[PDB]
Amino acid sequence: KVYDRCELARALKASGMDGYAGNSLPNWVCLSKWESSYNTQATNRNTDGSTDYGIFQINSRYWCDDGRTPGAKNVCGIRCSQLLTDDLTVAIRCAKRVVLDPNGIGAWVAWRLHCQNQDLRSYVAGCGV
Numbered sequence: 001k002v003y004d005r006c007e008l009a010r011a012l013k014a015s016g017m018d019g020y021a022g023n024s025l026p027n028w029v030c031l032s033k034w035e036s037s038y039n040t041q042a043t044n045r046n047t048d049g050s051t052d053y054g055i056f057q058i059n060s061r062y063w064c065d066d067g068r069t070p071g072a073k074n075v076c077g078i079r080c081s082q083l084l085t086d087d088l089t090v091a092i093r094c095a096k097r098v099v100l101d102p103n104g105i106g107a108w109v110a111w112r113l114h115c116q117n118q119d120l121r122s123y124v125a126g127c128g129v
């Protein structure tokens with residue numbers, strides 16, 4: 001599913017992401033936009049054999065099992081396929097686990113590049129949340 005921006009904001013807000021580990025909602029909408037363009041089915045193959053999955057583009061070397069990633073750990077304890085569903089429940093749960101590590105939201109390259117230190121008001125503008 002390709003989420004609408006406000007539709008995504010409402011689902012994140014409803015799932016307790018606004019302030020999760022000190023990361024306000026606009027942070028999460030901005031990273032989703034630059035990481036996958038709000039598409040839950042996005043996938044990206046990396047040069048190291050790992051693949052990024054879903055709306056948050058979670059990497060298979062560390063967080064999920066895709067069965068073809070060498071030296072993988074699967075910390076979220078899931079199949080990467082579960083990160084591609086229209087339903088965000090597993091993705092949100094795994095994203096919550098990722099931000100608890102030492103690097104926080106800095107784990108996402110798109111956040112570091114396009115969201116970090118920026119004015120993120122426009123990402124939730126007009127959503128009513």
Ligand SMILES: CC(=O)N[C@H]1[C@H](Oc2ccc3c(C)cc(=O)oc3c2)O[C@H](CO)[C@@H](O[C@@H]2O[C@H](CO)[C@@H](O)[C@H](O)[C@H]2NC(C)=O)[C@@H]1O
Binds near residue numbers: 059102
């Ligand atoms: C959201 C997701 O899956 N993010 C993970 C991620 O994913 C990517 C995915 C795509 C790219 C692309 C296209 C380019 C580029 O330059 O870097 C990337 C990192 O890779 C890093 C790189 O190692 C993982 O960070 C590493 O993850 C674990 C988990 O906390 C730590 O133990 C390490 O310390 C930490 N490595 C470093 C050096 O930051 C982080 O989790």
